[PDB]
Write a protein that binds this ligand. Structure first.
Ligand SMILES: O=C(O)CNC(=O)C(=O)O
Ligand SMILES: [Mn+2]
Length: 376
DNA sequence: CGATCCGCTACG
DNA sequence: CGTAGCTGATCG
């Protein structure tokens, strides 16, 4: 699977770039590999290297462990129960480093670690190169302007109507938009709701070989490769495990339904993640994501033509500047996060996990990494 | 109990 | 695309 070898090389080269920034010995990339063959990607790796190098120098600590926090949470605790969330806010407060009457919105790259150094949240503003943002802009635009596509049809079909908060009508930007608002999710293999005691199969959005879902995957391999390499700098065990899981699902036809389609999708899946969701022109209320493993680190990428983006993390007493090209890695099942409506058009690519694909592939799901792992 | 959960299936 | 069916665990 050359796609996975490509993202492995991107991850390894990004690690060498970062190491070289930290030691003062500039890394000299010499191999005739996929990074030499994709200079746009190489340059974007350099830009990410500089942002990650800054984030590692700016670590706030909370006075509790992720372990205790996750023990207190119930399996589907997403933030909608105010009494429970008051219990969490009192039991697990921001601490002295973060509490502050009226703190300023953050702009420098940074991270939040727990009392035993596990990374909970990694903030990478201006991480994605303009060239790759243009590529993503075009891929999302193609998806969100398709005349009879999911977003347009789902728009019109429920514009006759003018619980499931992720597609709630009032969260979508109203009026004329270049990009029809909506949500589409993609996965090489996953389970139907309430149906996990069976083999996973391809997401319905990706099953047509020439439908728009597969075409969207085809437009973004350079971006997915960048995102995967960033993940590898933050939690290398999780990156390597995700890649191993995809290789196993590719190799063993007994693990999925419709394995031939799963294999053709994996061949264009340039990512370590289990799943990718595209959220177009939608505000995001404060929430936790409950369907993945709490040990899983999700990655958010935000884009578009807007200028006042803010990502809110109330448990950290922080607001973060969240403008196009910003990347946020976070334990989304622990960390409450939200993104208010913005004055312009926006999309988000959210990368996340399905733990039982790890079980099915015989690959342990690793516990969240510590910051010192960056310096080994 | 009913409602909910980043959903698939066969049909129209 | 939508609709109804289907699953099992959580949550109120
Ligand atoms: O909208 C954003 O930028 C962030 N999105 C999410 O956290 C989500 O949809 O789960
Ligand atoms: Mn989320």
């Amino acid at each position: 699977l050359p796609s996975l070898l490509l993202i492995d090389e991107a991850a390894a080269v990004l690690g060498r770039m970062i190491q070289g920034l930290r030691t003062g010995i500039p890394y000299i990339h010499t191999e005739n590999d996929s990074i030499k063959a994709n200079p746009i990607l190489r340059t974007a790796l350099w830009q990410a290297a500089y942002v990650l190098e800054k984030a590692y120098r700016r670590r706030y600590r909370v006075p509790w462990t992720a372990r205790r926090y996750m023990r207190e949470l119930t399996p589907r605790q997403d933030g909608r129960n105010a009494n429970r969330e008051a219990v969490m806010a009192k039991e697990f407060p921001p601490g002295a480093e973060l509490n502050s009457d009226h703190p300023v919105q953050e702009i420098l790259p940074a991270m939040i670690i727990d009392a035993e150094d596990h990374i909970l949240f990694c903030y990478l503003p201006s991480c994605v190169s303009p060239a790759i943002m243009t590529i993503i802009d075009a891929a999302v635009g193609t998806l969100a302007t398709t005349k009879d596509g999911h977003l347009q049809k789902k728009s019109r079909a429920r514009e006759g109507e003018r619980a499931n908060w992720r597609e709630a009508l009032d969260l979508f930007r109203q009026g004329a938009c270049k990009m029809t608002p909506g949500v589409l999710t993609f996965a090489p293999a996953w389970w139907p709701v309430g149906h996990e005691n069976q083999l996973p199969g391809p997401a319905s959005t990706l099953k047509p070989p020439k439908g728009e879902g597969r075409m969207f995957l085809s437009d973004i391999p350079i971006a997915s490769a960048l995102v995967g390499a960033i993940l590898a700098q933050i939690n290398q065990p999780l990156f390597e495990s995700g890649v191993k899981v995809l290789r196993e699902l590719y190799s063993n036809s007994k693990l999925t339904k419709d394995h031939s389609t799963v294999s053709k999708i994996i061949e264009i899946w340039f990512s370590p993640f289990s799943s990718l969701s595209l959220i177009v022109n939608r505000a995001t209320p404060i929430h936790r994501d409950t369907s993945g493993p709490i040990e899983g680190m999700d990655i958010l990428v935000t884009g578009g033509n807007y200028s006042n983006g803010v990502l809110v993390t109330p448990s950290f007493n922080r607001r973060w500047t969240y403008n196009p090209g910003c990347v946020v890695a976070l334990l989304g099942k622990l960390v409450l996060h939200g993104v208010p409506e913005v004055d312009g058009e926006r999309y988000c690519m959210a990368h996340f996990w399905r733990e039982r694909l790890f079980d099915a592939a015989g690959v342990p799901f690793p516990y969240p990494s510590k910051w010192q792992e960056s310096y080994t």
